[PDB]
Homo-oligomer: A and B are copies of this chain.
Amino acid sequence: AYDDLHEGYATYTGSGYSGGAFLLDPIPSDMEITAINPADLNYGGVKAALAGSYLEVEGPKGKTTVYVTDLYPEGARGALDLSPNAFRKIGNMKDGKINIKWRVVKAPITGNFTYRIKEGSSRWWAAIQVRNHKYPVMKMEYEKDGKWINMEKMDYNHFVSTNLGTGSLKVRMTDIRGKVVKDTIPKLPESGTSKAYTVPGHVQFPE
């Protein structure tokens, strides 16, 4: 629609395949990825607003799409830190830094959300990650007896809250376009889970 490009500089790097901030591991080594500067990451006042998104990136030599897996701490506004397999498609690596133009695009994925329930989660406190989302997840709310509680998004790309209640958790998710989709996670453990675990989801953002 109204869908502005973002101008900035790209560098390249080899981290982000493992141990990146957004806790999105494992990353296939053939995957084209990127680290994003803090200002653009936390769009809308949401920590990790753009975590797990995909960007289309024009360099002086071509255009390419990258999965956003990590924070680029020392990056200026507009700055991306690309994997070299991605970088090489849009610029010469002889130059260390290239002019780029990027925007958020729809993820080249299929199927539904997958939920990751962080280690330490319970009815008392929980951090919930959304994976496999066609668009940036701006918001996640759960219903506790009648009303909708907003969950804060963290730097580690999980939505977080307390006293969530017993019983299965009905949730809703909003994307960067304002689209909202509803789902249901199975009831949380009474005592904090020693291991993080996976819940296959039943919904996806609209095309």
In the complex, whether A183 has a CB less than 8 A from a CB of chain B is no
The A interface, classified by DSSP as helix, strand, loop or mixed, is loop
Interface segment out of the listed A22-30, A36-44, A92-100, A118-126: A118-126
Q: Contact at A191–B122, with CB atoms within 8 Å?
A: no
In the complex, whether A194 has a CB less than 8 A from a CB of chain B is yes
Q: How many residues of A are in contact with the other chain, CB < 8 A?
A: 8
Contact with A194, one of B124, B125, B191 (Cβ below 8 angstroms) = B191
**In the complex the two chains form, what is the Cα distance from A191 to B118 in whole Å?**
12
Residues on B with C-beta less than 8 A from A122 are: 120
Q: Contact at B124–A191, with CB atoms within 8 Å?
A: no
Closest to A194 in B: B194
Min distance, Cβ A189 to any Cβ of chain B, angstroms: 11
Residues of chain A having any CB pair with chain B under 8 Å: 119-120, 122, 124-125, 191-192, 194
